[PDB]
Amino acid sequence: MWFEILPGIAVMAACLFIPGMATAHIHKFTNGGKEKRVAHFSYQWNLMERDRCISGVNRYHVTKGLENID
Amino acid sequence: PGIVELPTLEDLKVQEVKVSSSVLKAAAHHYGAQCDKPNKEFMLCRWEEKDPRRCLEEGKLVNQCALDFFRQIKRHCAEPFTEYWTCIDYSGLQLFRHCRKQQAKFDECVLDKLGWVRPDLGELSKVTKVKTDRPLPENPYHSRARPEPNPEAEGDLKPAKHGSRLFFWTM
């Protein structure tokens, strides 16, 4: 019957579903938990480069709070 | 064309803030509304002097005044502060609309332990009458002298002597 469309179309439900899963998971993986910071304007990029520079480990995606400040 | 004399490496050792962007932006408004005294005249120095080298003395003060504000939180509700700024970073835009509950927690803590009120909308975006001691530069662009303009035309009009004077034409 008409329900035989479901498993043929379920491949699409798997094909067009993992790219979002791949990106979202790797975004948390590449950037260490937090999602990738976006910089559509120069101000945000200047923030990121400052975060990378202040990181010491030279990665923008690792942040330090009040612990360093004494 | 001359000397490009610039400050030595001696004065370029300030206690640089070691925080990241999220913790910087988590406070932001409170820091802006509590450390405006060293921010305003330093920025005014940046505009009036038109030269980074002449505003080194105010450049270190703003960084130094940041520490006094920052360690003041550490002696206070810094644990709610940590929960806040560790929730802001998770958003890629570093946007406050997704961290309203921690916005309250930081605000309610800082409201009574210290008293720094939340700056209302548009309050930071305000030209201020910052008091200053330095005199205004006589020429911020170090402009040289100005060429003397050509002498001004004047005198009442007089009829052209002997008319057109072009070849034999008269009158």
Side-chain angles (χ1 to χ4, degrees), chain B residues 125-148:
Chain B
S125 171
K126 254 196 194 200
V127 185
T128 36
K129 54 207 177 173
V130 46
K131 270 311 296 171
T132 324
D133 193 297
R134 56 198 257 272
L136 54 99
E138 71 287 356
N139 48 353
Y141 302 72
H142 276 230
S143 95
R144 71 182 200 131
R146 191 72 28 245
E148 163 65 42

Side-chain angles (χ1 to χ4, degrees), chain B residues 55-125:
Chain B
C55 306
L56 262 299
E57 67 282 9
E58 299 113 330
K60 53 211 195 193
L61 221 34
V62 52
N63 231 340
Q64 169 266 347
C65 205
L67 276 36
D68 324 315
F69 153 81
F70 273 124
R71 62 202 137 195
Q72 264 212 338
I73 273 73
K74 216 147 171 197
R75 282 162 301 211
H76 297 94
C77 261
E79 181 46 50
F81 189 31
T82 36
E83 307 159 20
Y84 190 30
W85 80 258
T86 45
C87 195
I88 284 299
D89 40 317
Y90 183 43
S91 96
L93 274 299
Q94 310 206 232
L95 60 83
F96 306 89
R97 69 161 293 224
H98 283 164
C99 301
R100 282 321 158 167
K101 73 275 289 183
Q102 297 94 13
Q103 193 54 350
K105 298 292 308 309
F106 199 20
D107 263 8
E108 279 109 37
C109 268
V110 75
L111 201 288
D112 39 39
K113 329 273 179 117
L114 287 306
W116 322 155
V117 310
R118 177 59 182 193
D120 184 30
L121 299 199
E123 260 166 13
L124 263 282
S125 171

Side-chain angles (χ1 to χ4, degrees), chain B residues 152-165:
Chain B
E152 97 311 348
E154 62 103 5
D156 322 67
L157 259 159
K158 201 72 52 57
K161 212 182 306 306
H162 312 315
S164 309
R165 294 216 305 280

Side-chain angles (χ1 to χ4, degrees), chain A residues 28 35 51 63-64 66 69, chain B residues 20-21 74 85 89-90 92:
Chain A
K28 311 228 208 261
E35 86 193 61
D51 297 306
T63 71
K64 285 173 311 273
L66 260 47
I69 277 73
Chain B
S20 325
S21 51
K74 216 147 171 197
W85 80 258
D89 40 317
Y90 183 43

